Design a protein around this ligand. Structure first.
Ligand code: HPK
Ligand code: HPK
Ligand code: HPK
Ligand code: HPK
Ligand code: NA
Ligand code: NA
Ligand code: NA
Ligand code: NA
Lengths: 283, 283, 283, 283
């Protein structure tokens, strides 16, 4: 499986989206799992999930790594509403266009917020819900906010550079020795290729601050079986929000990885894959 | 598999144990997993683990459900040292007598303390370490101590009655509707059959208070891959000790079950079994 | 100062209250501080606050220890709405009847919920806000709910007895040696004197469960300078809600007392008095 | 009161210190309060405490703002043992040289660690113990370590610059608008004036890593009445260590300030002063 060989585009039409181009990477043919990426500069479906797509497809799933609006090879957009909800509308437009009735969701950070809004807005269109450090869930009980990683992500958005990209990647990972020239170069390419995405994200953040993303009050509505994952060492989204979700969602469990940065799906790919596949199969 | 058909006895000789009778239930023939029970009145290997033994044996493990000294059908004892360490000596004596060189351990509460002391004292004799609400790890950062469940466990030790047994079982479970006459009767039988165990436990607790059980300071020595499990709704041992372990043990992960009392292995048996088996196979 | 000599009654008329009798104890003549009691059986203004009224009056405050509707010598009531809000309406009716334009509030548990609803509903009628283990603020991130103390409080409501009263008082206090025959007798008298209050509270709880009391989502509206106090060892309302308030209210501080049960105002009266008086004078 | 007019030097002789020059600022003549500063580059007694010295002296205390070895105008040193203990030896040498039998201590961060070691090593030489974000107390239950602020403090030590100094000061404060040219210039002067202190601190940190500073296991020995303070928004030392202390020290209380960085004594000087003075007078 490669980015090139899985790469697809589809036009969506859904509340506020008109003939809007969505890029995604797709493989496999069984039950659909849509994976949704974080909101850092250069983020995209393949970049965030290339260690997971293979094992999920081997397990029998149809995997769609979606580029959210205003990221990677999806169309540029300036959003005046909180991104979780707008992104969720885009997931529904994608599913409608592809004739997918129900999907399991996997969401990292901004993608976790997307997945939560999707589950809230379209409960008949979701299977299982998998959340990896979901963002926007209001204040932490322990962590000063904005968190260290979020500050760096905004710095990179405003002043993109390879050095600042490196710094950010150093804070994303517990084990900085895992940061290869290849990982850096790939993220830098997504940044260099679509500078407008960076400008638009900052404009959107002024229109709809992070507090507007907080869906905490509605967590009780979620009936999807939910699997919450967190890196113990996540410097981007606070560990105690893993507990907030576990207490507020009806059917949830929480798995926390030791020696693990924000990207549990990448830094602990093997264990992440086995747990999530098991959950999809047996929970 | 039944209690009767798996029931075995063996004499142990180890530091402070002389021709000391240990009861255990054993089945299967592959890699050894010794499961270690909690410290409440009536506790024993079969009682705590009868929902787990079958699936672990089906998975290919040799399962030994051990009765710790001063519980169930093991010999009565008054302990002047912290129970985790004394119990761990008993596990080593059992393994020595059965010619078992290395075992994976699963430990609930008092059994979790046992498993931690075993890993500390005999690091060459342990495989993987599985901890389910381990007790004795010092103060909670949030929970007033003694915890509600611990108070009830001491009340039952001092004044055993079927009513107080019922109360305790109600606090052990998140879903009290899961408390059958059969579960009650079985725990009550272990209490009625060996009243001396109750007296001796209380005497032991006066000699060696819970603070003596705290091995927090030595957690950094543990090299066993460790899987920590907790019920979100555990009223016996505090949820934040799951985090204490995750931060202090080198290679650990933490799984917390929603809508789950202290006994995650019983209340969430299916998920518990799948996760722990997966961990033993693949971690 | 005595209960008898401070005892007053006033009729209130406010949204849903018609010629409704409120009992209170009043002393002093400077700025008004209304203290609001917890929701346990037998609770009342004097009982909860008799260690605080003297020092506050010596400091120059007019102190009103209010009996909330359905407690002590206030009129019986069955409430179909969450008690915080209904109680707050009663505080406003009391202030209106006494020609008090603004008051500082001190609220324990149910009284803390009252004080929060008052601050939200009538922001021009409050000075400073003092909260001592306020109840009803939704789930804890650590504590299984209902908490141990809340279970006991409901047990006493349903089956009042002097023994169960004693048990409850034992769980309220960190230092059980502080429980005198006098304290017990006084609480028991309030229970014996108005059995109907007990029945009505249980009926009200069925109509308006604790989740209906959660005003977390509105905490951002509070502009009152706020002083949050908690007993470290509170078995009735969870310590982490002290942090929830500190993060969600604009101008707040949190003081936690070691070796202190739920009743910080009683168990640590001297320090409580000095801190709260200082806050009222200088914050 | 000014830095110049309060400035004093004294030679100390104590375990490992021989004719070692200590600088301090002193004023007042009643009970002695020694204030102990943090470990960031440029830190010193006056810099950390100039908003507190006046009010404490007005209150009747003799205030000594001590420069710890290897900071400000105290002698340079390379330490091969954990700094808390070495600093505490220096406090005892200072008290011995000045004929001070007992002192109250106030300690910020590294100074909090100093104060804890002093209380442990010389319990007959301490009055009350005041701790403001004490450092070195082992892992956080929530915060990835090293914390954001600690990373920046090390960066400034290795590559001192006015820009990096500014960055660090921005992370120290909740309200960055409080950072004046005067505060910056004063900290920069302490850095520019003694570059060797910077080199030596980094060498010392290699010899004695932060884990060597953890005295958690001995907290039970402290009999001093203890007042623990924390900024809610402290990005240097984790808020949950405030709870660790409150649970582990016999007679403690915890006060947390909203909208407050690491330096509670500076950012919330007025409230800090009133609380600590009250504690010294009345606790
Ligand atoms: O790959 C990434 O860009 C990634 O993991 C981003 C994480 C942070 C993120 O999207 C976020 C956005 C809003 C609030 C919190 C967090
Ligand atoms: O089955 C049981 O008896 C059980 O799960 C007991 C749990 C509590 C327990 O053994 C314990 C002992 C010491 C400290 C904390 C907890
Ligand atoms: O004196 C008392 O009755 C007292 O302190 C009661 C505390 C518990 C309480 O009123 C409460 C009510 C609802 C939710 C949480 C707590
Ligand atoms: O003024 C300062 O330099 C200050 O507040 C420093 C705080 C951090 C600090 O000294 C520290 C040292 C070791 C571990 C944690 C924290
Ligand atoms: Na490498
Ligand atoms: Na049934
Ligand atoms: Na007495
Ligand atoms: Na200014």
């Amino acid at each position: 499986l490669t980015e090139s060989s899985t790469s697809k585009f589809v036009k969506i039409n859904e509340k506020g989206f008109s003939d809007f181009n969505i890029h995604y990477n797709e493989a496999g043919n069984g039950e659909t799992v849509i994976m949704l990426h974080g909101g850092g500069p250069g983020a995209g479906g393949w970049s965030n999930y290339y260690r997971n797509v293979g094992p999920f497809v081997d397990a029998g799933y149809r995997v769609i790594l979606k580029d959210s609006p205003g990221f990677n090879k999806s169309d540029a957009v300036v959003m005046d509403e909180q991104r979780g909800l707008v992104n969720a509308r885009a997931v529904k437009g994608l599913m409608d266009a592809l004739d997918i009735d129900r999907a399991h969701l996997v969401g990292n950070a901004m993608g976790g917020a997307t997945a939560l809004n999707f589950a809230l807005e379209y409960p008949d269109r979701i299977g299982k819900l998998i959340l990896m450090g979901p963002g926007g869930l209001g204040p932490s009980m322990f962590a000063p906010m904005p968190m260290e990683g979020i500050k760096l992500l905004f710095k990179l958005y405003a002043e993109p550079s390879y050095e600042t990209l490196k710094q950010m990647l150093q804070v994303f990972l517990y084990d900085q020795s895992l940061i290869t020239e290849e990982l850096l170069q790939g993220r830098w390419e997504a940044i260099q290729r679509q500078p407008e995405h960076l400008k638009n994200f900052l404009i959107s953040a002024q229109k709809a601050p992070l507090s507007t993303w907080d869906v905490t009050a509605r967590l009780g509505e979620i009936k999807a079986k939910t699997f919450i994952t967190w890196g113990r060492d996540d410097r981007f989204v606070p560990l105690d929000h893993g507990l907030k979700l576990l207490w507020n969602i009806d059917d949830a469990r929480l798995h926390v990885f030791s020696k693990c940065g924000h990207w549990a799906q990448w830094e602990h790919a093997d264990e992440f894959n086995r747990l999530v596949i098991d959950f999809l199969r047996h929970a």
